[PDB]
Design a protein around this motif. Structure first.
Motif, short mmCIF file in Angstrom:
data_model
loop_
_atom_site.label_atom_id
_atom_site.label_comp_id
_atom_site.label_asym_id
_atom_site.label_seq_id
_atom_site.Cartn_x
_atom_site.Cartn_y
_atom_site.Cartn_z
N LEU A 1 12.17 30.59 -5.70
CA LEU A 1 11.30 29.42 -5.79
C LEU A 1 12.09 28.10 -5.91
N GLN A 2 13.17 28.13 -6.68
CA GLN A 2 14.05 26.96 -6.77
C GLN A 2 14.70 26.65 -5.43
N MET A 3 15.10 27.69 -4.70
CA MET A 3 15.70 27.52 -3.38
C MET A 3 14.70 27.00 -2.37
N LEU A 4 13.46 27.47 -2.46
CA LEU A 4 12.34 26.96 -1.67
C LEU A 4 12.20 25.46 -1.87
N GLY A 5 12.25 25.03 -3.13
CA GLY A 5 12.22 23.63 -3.49
C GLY A 5 13.35 22.82 -2.88
N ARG A 6 14.54 23.40 -2.90
CA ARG A 6 15.70 22.70 -2.37
C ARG A 6 15.65 22.67 -0.84
N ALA A 7 15.15 23.75 -0.23
CA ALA A 7 15.12 23.85 1.23
C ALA A 7 14.11 22.89 1.83
N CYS A 8 12.94 22.77 1.21
CA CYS A 8 11.89 21.92 1.75
C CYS A 8 12.24 20.44 1.64
N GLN A 9 13.23 20.11 0.81
CA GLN A 9 13.70 18.74 0.71
C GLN A 9 14.92 18.48 1.59
N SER B 1 9.60 13.87 -9.81
CA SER B 1 8.95 13.72 -8.51
C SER B 1 8.48 15.10 -8.02
N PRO B 2 7.25 15.49 -8.38
CA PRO B 2 6.72 16.82 -8.05
C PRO B 2 6.71 17.10 -6.55
N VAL C 1 4.07 29.06 -2.19
CA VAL C 1 4.64 28.88 -0.85
C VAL C 1 3.70 28.01 0.00
N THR C 2 2.41 28.33 -0.02
CA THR C 2 1.41 27.52 0.68
C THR C 2 1.38 26.07 0.20
N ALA C 3 1.46 25.87 -1.12
CA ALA C 3 1.44 24.54 -1.67
C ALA C 3 2.66 23.74 -1.22
N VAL C 4 3.82 24.39 -1.16
CA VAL C 4 5.02 23.71 -0.67
C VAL C 4 4.85 23.35 0.81
N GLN C 5 4.38 24.30 1.60
CA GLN C 5 4.11 24.05 3.02
C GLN C 5 3.14 22.89 3.22
N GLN C 6 2.06 22.87 2.44
CA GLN C 6 1.06 21.80 2.57
C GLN C 6 1.57 20.45 2.10
N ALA C 7 2.47 20.44 1.12
CA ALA C 7 2.91 19.18 0.56
C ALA C 7 4.10 18.59 1.31
N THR C 8 4.84 19.42 2.04
CA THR C 8 6.09 18.95 2.65
C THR C 8 6.18 19.24 4.13
N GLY C 9 5.28 20.07 4.64
CA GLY C 9 5.32 20.50 6.02
C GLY C 9 6.35 21.58 6.29
N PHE C 10 6.89 22.16 5.22
CA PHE C 10 7.94 23.16 5.37
C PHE C 10 7.51 24.41 6.12
#
Length: 134
Positions: free
Chosen positions: A114-122, A20-21, A45-54
């Motif tokens: 980057l892995q922590m970014l992934g965990r935080a945005c979820q 689940s990307p 970082v921008t892509a994570v923000q845009q995809a999750t609202g983080f």
């Protein structure tokens, strides 16, 4: 073995672009994650923000614009922000240091960030952490 940080770019790809990307663009690769340019990190970082609202409201003006961030000091300041927000959301000290990142050093720690970014945005949007960091 499985504990070593060697090749942990593989864990980054699985955390951000696995079953689940978190986001589809940019496509992550071993090449980029082994020697991460600032612009690529800004993209992610921008892509994570845009995809999750983080981290809503963390950045504005030139910080939002990757091509506008050219000075080393500005790159460091940008990274310092998102690293503090991710750390606060997770309640964990991220090992990545902005000055190391900007220099291309400790890329395995950049991958941990980057892995922590992934965990935080979820875990949450980090809205209150942003206001605390600002």
């Amino acid at each position: 073995g499985a504990a070593s940080m060697c090749d942990n770019w593989q864990a980054t790809i699985d955390t951000l672009q696995g079953a689940s990307p978190v986001f589809d663009k940019p496509k992550l690769s071993q090449k980029l994650l082994e020697k991460p340019p600032f612009r690529f990190l800004h993209d992610v970082v921008t892509a994570v923000q845009q995809a999750t609202g983080f981290a809503p409201g963390l950045y504005q003006g030139d910080e939002l614009d990757g091509k506008a961030i050219q000075e080393k000091d500005a790159k460091v300041a940008y990274l310092k922000k998102i690293i503090e927000v991710v750390s606060m959301v997770l309640g964990e000290q991220c090992p990545a240091r902005p000055n190391k990142i900007v220099a291309g050093l400790e890329p395995e720690n950049t991958n941990i960030f980057l892995q922590m970014l992934g965990r935080a945005c979820q875990k949450g949007n980090g809205a209150k952490a942003v206001q605390k960091v600002l």
